[PDB]
């Protein structure tokens, strides 16, 4: 599923992300825009052979099992395929675990480089929320 901007904001808010660990909803929508262009089925292979999955490009090195990332962990206890569903539930819930682990949203490179310190509210402007 490919979401509209406001459409995904509304879905993320439904699933408990708005101000989760002090991170406003705009932060989450901005991260998703630059990670996946709002596509639940986005995948990208990393140089170490791990792969990032879904709307927030969660990494099989630590957070899910895909069967082709040797010596990795599965801290969200899920197959990586779970992070590609039209239903954003598994991605939101594993993201809550990642952002709560010490490094906050700096875990997401696109967030650090393109959203952090920006006017992230723009990302929810015009959305019925
Ligand atoms: Na893994």
Swiss-Prot record:
Family according to the record: Belongs to the glycosyl hydrolase 22 family.
Active site feature: 35, 52
Transmembrane segments: none
Subcellular location as annotated: Secreted
Keyword field: Allergen, Antimicrobial, Bacteriolytic enzyme, Disulfide bond, Glycosidase, Hydrolase, Secreted, Signal
Gene3D superfamilies attached to this UniProt entry: 1.10.530.10
Upper taxonomic lineage: Eukaryota, Metazoa, Chordata, Craniata, Vertebrata
Enzyme class: hydrolase
Stored InterPro entries: Glyco_hydro_22, Glyco_hydro_22_CS, Glyco_hydro_22_lys, Lysozyme-like_dom_sf
PROSITE patterns in UniProt: GLYCOSYL_HYDROL_F22_1, GLYCOSYL_HYDROL_F22_2
Function of the molecule: Lysozymes have primarily a bacteriolytic function; those in tissues and body fluids are associated with the monocyte-macrophage system and enhance the activity of immunoagents. Has bacteriolytic activity against M.luteus.
Positions bound to substrate: 101
Subunit (UniProt): Monomer.
Reaction equations catalysed: Hydrolysis of (1->4)-beta-linkages between N-acetylmuramic acid and N-acetyl-D-glucosamine residues in a peptidoglycan and between N-acetyl-D-glucosamine residues in chitodextrins
Additional remarks: Lysozyme C is capable of both hydrolysis and transglycosylation; it also shows a slight esterase activity. It acts rapidly on both peptide-substituted and unsubstituted peptidoglycan, and slowly on chitin oligosaccharides.
Domain C-type lysozyme: 1-129
GO molecular function: beta-N-acetylglucosaminidase activity; identical protein binding; lysozyme activity
Keyword field contains Secreted: yes
Cellular component GO terms, alphabetical: cytoplasm; endoplasmic reticulum; extracellular space
Tissue specificity field: In the egg white and polymorphonuclear leukocytes.
GO biological process terms held by the UniProt record: cell wall macromolecule catabolic process; defense response to bacterium; defense response to Gram-negative bacterium; defense response to Gram-positive bacterium; killing of cells of another organism
Name assigned to this protein: Lysozyme C
Pfam families in alphabetical order: Lys
S-S bonds: 6-127, 30-115, 64-80, 76-94
Enzyme Commission numbers on file: 3.2.1.17
